[model samples]
Target: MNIFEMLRIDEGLRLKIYKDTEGYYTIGIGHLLTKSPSLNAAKSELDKAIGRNTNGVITKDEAEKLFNQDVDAAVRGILRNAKLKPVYDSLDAVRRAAIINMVFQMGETGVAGFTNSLRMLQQKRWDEAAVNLAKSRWYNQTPNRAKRVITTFRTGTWDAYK
Candidate 1:
């Protein structure tokens, strides 16, 4: 019924700890292990929550609920950066989604480092923004994905590349 419910069904409600396809420690819907406490931190958190170190389990409903909270935090992190907020708010939905994906992949600080691209975006200089994005190290690091996002930002259409 809700977004979390849909994600739970889509990501699958795993009760036991398991390595995801990429083999990062994952649990409760699709939450990937990130920096800070890291995987070790999650292990301790799991132990505290389930009263065990290994074979920890969580309910499907609860996992969905926890996943919802995690998504909210991630979205807030993407949107709350002072340097990026204006550019993010100025874009259309399709372009906005592309930027959000970039921020999610690159991290807020990493995405914010694209000062030239963000400036171009804020000025509505789509061509310059696209060019800046293409010239960035991120583009070189992930060409296919970067090309898709750059095309979306430039043309305001998903089919621009084709």
Candidate 2:
């Protein structure tokens, strides 16, 4: 709900880059191709999203503006779960960011099934939370990415996986 938490979700949602249905390169939650200072500037940023790809670029200002819009809308879509409110509220910045990241990736409803993990987080059981995260199909689908978040959860440090 806060700025950084939502931004984490935004970043997680943008972890991959792909073209839109019209074959226009898109990144950071359906951010359509926008105007950049030059094709070079835009391509540089786009390439970082989907390597060496696209015939266009978006300006830094435009990209940030569009990204903020995207994150605001997506955060509103996060399904409510009153049961998890206190648990979520008790978490520190990084821990909350990781949870919000999951919500962004899987949708709020999708993460609701993480009962054990949520419980562990509520209890401040970092190791257990990480273990529970690894047990998820989400982790199975993307072990490396999962490891990064899981390490963050366990260590409460941003560079645990780096």
Candidate 3:
């Protein structure tokens, strides 16, 4: 029933460095080193999280700490958008998590393109908002995940993604 729990499931923990579907270098619950400002710093953080570990294994203790840090940054970034801030805050806990999940997957800017959906969310128009999101390029790329998020928007249910 927790947002992080659902997110962790969606991401799937992978301690070792591996190419994501789009070929981006990712690790530990989908933390994209490329998403960080500096690859060196990101790798440094990863190494530190894993205790100077090689690309071999990253325990849950290590992976989770890194995951929280990444999640925090993603939250801040989501709130930084003037347009999305109020809309995000206006959402229920379930829908708010849905928004955060989108940002986590695509980055803030990536979600920004959903202007129509964001506006629909702002108006609290659940059906239209869900439809708007489902009509996007994002929906096309990852329908499974998008469907979950869309369902959350429409139903305002905690485990819609489940």
Candidate 4:
């Protein structure tokens, strides 16, 4: 699968506000509306984004648009990180999408913090790279999704999910 399709399923298509696994207010394929400075501001932003009163619901069109924008932002975010960019360039397409998938959820900074995993990934140490991912708090937070990512790292393929 491609980056867009992988993320579209992984993040799911939510049109209404909901709390993610980590209890953050999210919507529209894992968009953290609460990334705003304050809780009220975040809620207001959510409201303004969809012109509220429908009880936190957004239209599918708007949600898909946001998904596309988010995917583009994520791609840019991954490519722009200095440390990540070098190793990112070393992978094949499937493995590359795995990196983009992780960054799409947690940001480039978050993935860059996986120092050991990143190193192993660069060395083409699939099992070691996956083990590092399994040890992370991110895995604990979203075990299933994290497992899928870790498996992709281990196998360098999206076939299982595809």
Q: Give the top-scoring candidate (lDDT).
A: 4
Task: Please give the range of 10 consecutive residues that has the lowest summed lDDT in model 1.
Answer: 1-10
**Candidate that beats the other on lDDT, 1 or 2, i.e. the better one:** 1
| TM-score on alpha carbons, each prediction | 0.63, 0.61, 0.86, 0.89
Q: Would you give me the overall lDDT of model 3?
A: 0.80
TM-score of decoy 1: 0.63
A best-first ranking of the candidates according to their lDDT comes to: 4, 3, 1, 2
| Residue lDDT tens for model 1, 89-111 | 88777777667667645568888
Tens-digit lDDT track of model 3 for 58-98: 77777788889878988898889987798888988888988
Model 2, CA-based lDDT: 0.63
lDDT, candidate 3, at 131? 78
lDDT of 4 by residue, 1-162 (tens): 788888888988888778777677788888888854455666687877666554567888888877888888887887888889988899988998899889988988899999988999999999888877799889998898998888887898786586
Q: Any idea what lDDT model 1 has?
A: 0.68
Query: Residue 86 lDDT in model 2?
Result: 64
lDDT of 4: 0.83
Better of 3 and 4 by TM-score: 4
Q: Name the runs in model 3 displaced over 4 angstroms.
A: 35-53
Weakest 10 consecutive residues of candidate 3 by summed lDDT: 33-42
